[PDB]
Amino acid sequence: GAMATAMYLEHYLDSIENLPSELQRNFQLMRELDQRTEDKKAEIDILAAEYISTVKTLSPDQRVERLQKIQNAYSKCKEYSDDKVQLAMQTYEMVDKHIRRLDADLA
Amino acid sequence: GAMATAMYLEHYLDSIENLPSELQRNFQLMRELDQRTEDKKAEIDILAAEYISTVKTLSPDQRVERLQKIQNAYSKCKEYSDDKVQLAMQTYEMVDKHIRRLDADLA
Ligand code: NA
C-alpha cells in the first residue's frame, strides 16, 4: 500500500502550518529535546577524541578520571534518547488522529 | 523584472566592477538561494522515498523520527520559496531605481 502511504503523507504535509495545538507543542518539545541530544553527542565526541590522542600522557587515576567522566555523559545522553522515544510514541497517536480527521474532511 | 535586469547586465557587460554593491550582493544571494532551494527539494524526494519504502516495518517512534526530518525540510522549502519571491522583488525594484537614474533621467 505505497499509494495510500504517499497520499496520506502528502495530505499531512499540506497541513503543517496549522496542526492541532498539542501536536505543535509535542514537535517543539521533541526539537528542544533533540538539541539537548545533539549537543551531548558533540560533547562526547570531544571527550572521546581528546582521550584517544592524549592517552599516553596519563596516570592510572587520570585514565579513571576520563572514563568515569565519559560514563556520566553517555548515561546522560541516554536519558535524552529514551525520553525522545517515549515522547515520539505519544506524538504518533496525535499524528494518526490528525491524518484521519484531515482525510475525512477531504473526502 | 527579468528583461529589465537582462538589459541592466548588458550595459555593464565589460565593466561589472562598476555594478553597485547592494545589487552585486543580491545577484549572488539569488544564485546561492536557488542552490539551497534545489537541494532541499531533492532531499525531500529521497526522505519521502525512504519513508514510503519502509513505513510498514517502522515502529511508531521511528515513524515519527522520519516525519520530523521531512516536515522540517518541507518547512524549509516553503521558507526558501518565500525568500526567493521577496529577494527577486527587492532585486527587481533596485534595478528599476538604478535604470531611472541612468537611462530615464528627467533632463
Ligand atoms: Na529636474
Side-chain angles (χ1 to χ4, degrees), chain A residues 57-94:
Chain A
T57 69
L58 300 173
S59 55
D61 72 79
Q62 288 179 314
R63 262 192 144 190
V64 171
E65 153 57 31
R66 300 294 203 287
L67 297 193
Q68 190 57 73
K69 181 148 185 152
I70 287 163
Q71 283 195 14
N72 298 335
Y74 269 128
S75 190
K76 188 70 195 181
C77 190
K78 191 59 160 69
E79 288 187 335
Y80 300 149
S81 293
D82 295 3
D83 288 359
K84 175 63 185 307
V85 171
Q86 293 307 299
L87 187 51
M89 284 195 295
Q90 291 165 215
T91 310
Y92 184 81
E93 299 300 286
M94 300 177 188

Side-chain angles (χ1 to χ4, degrees), chain A residues 12 14 27 34 84 92, chain B residues 63 65 68 71 74 78:
Chain A
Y12 177 65
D14 298 334
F27 277 119
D34 283 337
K84 175 63 185 307
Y92 184 81
Chain B
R63 288 185 174 181
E65 290 268 306
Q68 265 184 303
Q71 276 185 149
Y74 197 95
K78 158 63 189 175

Side-chain angles (χ1 to χ4, degrees), chain B residues 50-72:
Chain B
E50 186 189 39
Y51 188 84
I52 292 156
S53 66
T54 65
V55 71
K56 287 263 71 172
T57 60
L58 281 178
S59 55
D61 57 299
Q62 284 286 79
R63 288 185 174 181
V64 172
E65 290 268 306
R66 302 300 182 282
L67 236 62
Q68 265 184 303
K69 303 210 311 304
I70 297 168
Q71 276 185 149
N72 295 331

Side-chain angles (χ1 to χ4, degrees), chain B residues 10-27:
Chain B
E10 189 67 2
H11 179 261
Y12 292 96
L13 177 53
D14 296 359
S15 302
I16 300 172
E17 68 269 327
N18 299 358
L19 197 154
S21 291
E22 60 168 13
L23 226 65
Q24 195 156 14
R25 164 99 283 210
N26 273 27
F27 292 141

Side-chain angles (χ1 to χ4, degrees), chain B residues 15-103:
Chain B
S15 302
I16 300 172
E17 68 269 327
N18 299 358
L19 197 154
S21 291
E22 60 168 13
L23 226 65
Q24 195 156 14
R25 164 99 283 210
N26 273 27
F27 292 141
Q28 208 198 351
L29 289 177
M30 288 193 325
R31 290 185 276 94
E32 286 176 1
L33 183 61
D34 283 0
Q35 266 289 282
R36 291 190 273 93
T37 306
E38 219 66 23
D39 292 354
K40 263 287 185 290
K41 285 192 167 181
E43 194 185 346
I44 290 160
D45 288 330
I46 291 165
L47 291 177
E50 186 189 39
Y51 188 84
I52 292 156
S53 66
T54 65
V55 71
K56 287 263 71 172
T57 60
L58 281 178
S59 55
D61 57 299
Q62 284 286 79
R63 288 185 174 181
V64 172
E65 290 268 306
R66 302 300 182 282
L67 236 62
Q68 265 184 303
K69 303 210 311 304
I70 297 168
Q71 276 185 149
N72 295 331
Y74 197 95
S75 287
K76 221 92 192 81
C77 271
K78 158 63 189 175
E79 192 169 307
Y80 292 162
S81 292
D82 290 9
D83 292 335
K84 203 197 298 83
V85 166
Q86 281 212 126
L87 189 61
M89 187 160 294
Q90 291 159 32
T91 304
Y92 290 159
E93 185 170 303
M94 282 181 191
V95 170
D96 289 354
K97 240 202 176 66
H98 281 267
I99 293 154
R100 276 185 261 252
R101 300 217 217 83
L102 273 74
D103 201 29

